[PDB]
Amino acid sequence: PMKGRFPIRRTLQYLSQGNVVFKDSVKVMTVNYNTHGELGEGARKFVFFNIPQIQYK
Amino acid sequence: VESFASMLRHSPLTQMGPAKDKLVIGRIFHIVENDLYIDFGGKFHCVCRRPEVDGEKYQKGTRVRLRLLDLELTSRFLGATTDTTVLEANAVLLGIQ
Amino acid sequence: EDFIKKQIEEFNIGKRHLANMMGEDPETFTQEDIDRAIAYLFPSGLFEKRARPVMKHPEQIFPRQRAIQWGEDGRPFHYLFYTGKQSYYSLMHDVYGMLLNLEKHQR
Amino acid sequence: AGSRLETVGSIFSRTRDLVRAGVLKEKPLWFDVYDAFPPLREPVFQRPRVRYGKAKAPIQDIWYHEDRIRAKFYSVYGSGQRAFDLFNPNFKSTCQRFVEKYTELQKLGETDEEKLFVETGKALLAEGVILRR
Amino acid sequence: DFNDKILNEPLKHSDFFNVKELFSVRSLFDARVHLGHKAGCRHRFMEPYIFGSRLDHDIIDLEQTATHLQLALNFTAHMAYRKGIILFISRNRQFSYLIENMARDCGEYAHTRYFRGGMLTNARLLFGPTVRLPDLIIFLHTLNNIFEPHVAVRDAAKMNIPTVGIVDTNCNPCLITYPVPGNDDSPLAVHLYCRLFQTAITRAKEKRQQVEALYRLQ
Amino acid sequence: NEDLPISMENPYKEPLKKCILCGKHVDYKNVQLLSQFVSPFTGCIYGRHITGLCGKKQKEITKAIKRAQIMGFMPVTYKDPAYLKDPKVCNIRYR
Amino acid sequence: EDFDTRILEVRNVFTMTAKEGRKKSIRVLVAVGNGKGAAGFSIGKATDRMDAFRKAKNRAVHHLHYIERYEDHTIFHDISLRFKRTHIKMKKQPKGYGLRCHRAIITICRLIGIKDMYAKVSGSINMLSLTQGLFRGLSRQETHQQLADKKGLHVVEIREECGPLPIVVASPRGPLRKDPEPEDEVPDVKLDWEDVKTAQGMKRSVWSNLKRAAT
Ligand SMILES: [Zn+2]
Ligand SMILES: [Zn+2]
């Protein structure tokens, strides 16, 4: 089997189903997310699951 | 109607407590020519040797008083996932009635 | 099973024929007479009696075998049938019962 | 025929689905009665797995506030003179009467455990029961 | 078809033979069925049937005990009314005499002596080609002297025969259909189970007799 | 409901038994005690199963014995004859 | 007579003895089945080939497992398992497909009565353990009535021949559940790199899609 904890992240259709496409203007995006931020759980799960979709798109 | 919890709380064993270092009266149900088995209480009977004094005074229905160590002899050894049992109980007698 | 009665009646008829041919009344007759007649009419140099010719009664010839131990349908008759050694175990049960009864009383 | 493999599942499942397949000529005797009066737990084979770590058991021991006083009485005045009779149900005993007195005194007067214990001792001495351990 | 109707009639009714009046938690507690071996003798699959523990001794849940006992008695009585063969097992030699005697009294049969290899599996070769193996097995002591699962539960689960065993804290209730938690070892418990089974099977037999007489009348 | 059990400690618990010296103090100068804790003839130190005390106290007294031996308070081979008529704590069977 | 037999393998086992030395002992594996979801595997050992066949066939017809099937021609859902270093992965497949599986599995399915599926075997190839794991999985698979009555929801089937139409498969026999399942997103499920490859299409191999014989 695949080794990642959520191999659907590494799958290709997961990257393609991403529903976001940035404008040609934005060149760089920076993220700052704490590890144990109980409010930052959303940020951490985003950085874990979604950024691959963004970078692929 | 009375709950089994109530019957156990008022049971003779819950008030008995630890079986060790406690006297109890009992009687025998089977007896071989050399030894006698007392049914005293709880689950198991206790096997005992016939004493040298008053040898013949041991028949069915005799009420003998005696102490006991535990109501079940068990022990767990190095390779015993379940502790070995004896199906009996150790006891020492010093009187009758 | 009917072969047993067949052999019995045929053996009785053969015994009557034997008495007739030897020449005595069939009213009184014995198995020592049977064996003497067989030894005389059919001698044999065979040494073992089991091999020598013998006209014996079928009850003693055939070894008794247990009849059907259960009825035509359903349960068996004896109460140890579902184990072997039923007769032995029933006898031992009766023996132990007698032992404990005598106990409570007291080649 | 009948299926001899029992680790698969329950006898009922096997008999039922074999009758459905049409292998057996007709059901056995116990089938209908089992279907009518099923048990609380379906009989299925499962292998026993020893425990490891902190998975000791859902079971816990049995103790009581009055068991505390039973312990304290067995410790202070132990080996009661009377011989316990386990045949008789609801058999009254020295320790049982003593725990009854303790409880009634403590939930009537609402005093300190040690002094109500001492006065329970005084009360049973007035009653005249022997106090030798 | 009316024969099948008579066979099926007792099923729809609950407690149709009045098996409930025989047993009560009073009688069980008096016979000391509620006892259990030490925690060292405890078993996982028996854990949930343990109401609790005291002095490292196991205690049985009497509500579950009564439920399983009711179910077992009802099943045995239905089978007896169907004239289904019943076979007892108690490898414990302490009560073989009493158990064989009550088996004789019932008319249902028993096997307390040593169990032979494949007695049920190869029964055809052992006894004969056509033989009616029993329709119900029950166990007064599920374990043997060495405390392994008696081969009979395995053989019955294999050859599709129902089993009803009194399971102690050491026993394996997984294979049992109607496991009855109780005290396999105590003489009061043994005698009480024997008397209950006597009453149940005899009631079922006499009830079949009376129903057959009523139908012969009609 | 009220008759039901309750989570609670076991007051039947026997208190943890303590060795004869679990609480007491030991020094390299109590030659009496340190000679009670050694064989009389060969001078060999009796082990734990002979002595019957906890490991911490066994270690303390054996180190103190070695210290006294090297210091001069005690000999190595023969137990002192004056300390023989004292209580025998260490169990034996040869007599 | 409803049962049909099949000999999966035969081998000439040899074990030595003091005075006679090497002894030939035929071992055989067999299966039996109706074609109605009931079947059974078995082994047979004997000095003679025909006698071993007979022993195996008899104790096979006596030892049998039953397995359900969805619409008389498929399993209910794909089954992936391992058994003695024998990984096996069967995939459900709709009609008009056939049986593209290990020939042993093909014969076993001929006996069972299912007409089409797919399967793959990985790791060791010991067809005894193969059959054992096969029957284990086909017995441990859950039916749709079972799953519906367990969960408390309505099963809904969707085809490609049929458009966006909900086809109910089975409903709970007991009281239906009130609330629906919350949408499980990005689930923690261990998937297979080979099937992900074959789905992404980048995978290439001459040996995959062959135009073999009938079924
Ligand atoms: Zn027991
Ligand atoms: Zn200490």
Q: What can you tell me about this protein's structure?
A:
- The structure is cut from a larger assembly and holds 7 protein chains of 7 kinds.
- With 57 residues, chain A is an all-alpha fold.
- Chain C is 52% helix and 0% strand.
- Chain C has 4 helices and no strands.
- Chain G is an alpha+beta fold and 215 residues long.
- Chain G is built from 5 helices and 10 strands; from the N terminus they run E-E-E-H-E-E-E-E-H-E-H-H-E-E-H.
- Chain G has a 4-stranded antiparallel beta sheet with strand order 1-2-3-4, with helices on both faces. In chain G, strands 5-6-8-7 form a 4-stranded mixed beta sheet, covered by helices on one side. Chain G has a two-stranded antiparallel ribbon with strand order 9-10.
- Chain G is globular, with a radius of gyration of 21 Å.
- Classes of the chains: A mainly alpha (57), B mainly beta (97), C mainly alpha (107), D mainly alpha (133), E alpha/beta (218), F mainly alpha (95), G alpha+beta (215).
- At the D-E interface, helix 1 and helix 2 of D face helix 1, strand 1, helix 3 and helix 6 of E.
- The complex binds zinc ion (ZN) (2 copies).
Any key phrases for this structure?
part of a larger assembly, 7 chains, A: 57 residues, mainly alpha, 0% strand, D: 133 residues, 5 helices, elongated, binds zinc ion, translation, Mitochondria
Number of strands of chain G: 10
Give the helix level of chain F as a range of percent. Answer: 25-40%
Please trace the helix and strand order of chain G, writing H or E for each element. Answer: EEEHEEEEHEHHEEH
Question: What is the straight-line distance between the termini of chain F?
Answer: 62 Å
Give the helix proportion of chain G (percent range).
25-40%
Choose one word for the global shape of chain F. Answer: elongated
Largest sheet of chain G: 4 strands, antiparallel
Number of helices of chain F: 3
Largest sheet of chain F: none
Which kinds of small molecule does this entry bind, naming each only once? zinc ion
Q: What is the strand arrangement across the widest sheet of chain G?
A: 1-2-3-4
How large a portion of the residues of chain F is in β-strands, by DSSP E?
Answer: under 5%
Question: What is the radius of gyration of chain F?
Answer: 19 Å
Distance from first to last alpha carbon of chain G: 25 Å
Q: Count of helical segments of chain G?
A: 5
What structural class should be given to the helix and strand makeup of chain G?
alpha+beta
Largest inter-chain interface?
D-E, 33 and 44 residues
Structural class of chain F: mainly alpha
Percentage of β-strand residues of chain G = 25-35%
Order of helices and strands of chain F: HHH
* Oligomeric state, counting identical vs distinct chains: part of a larger assembly
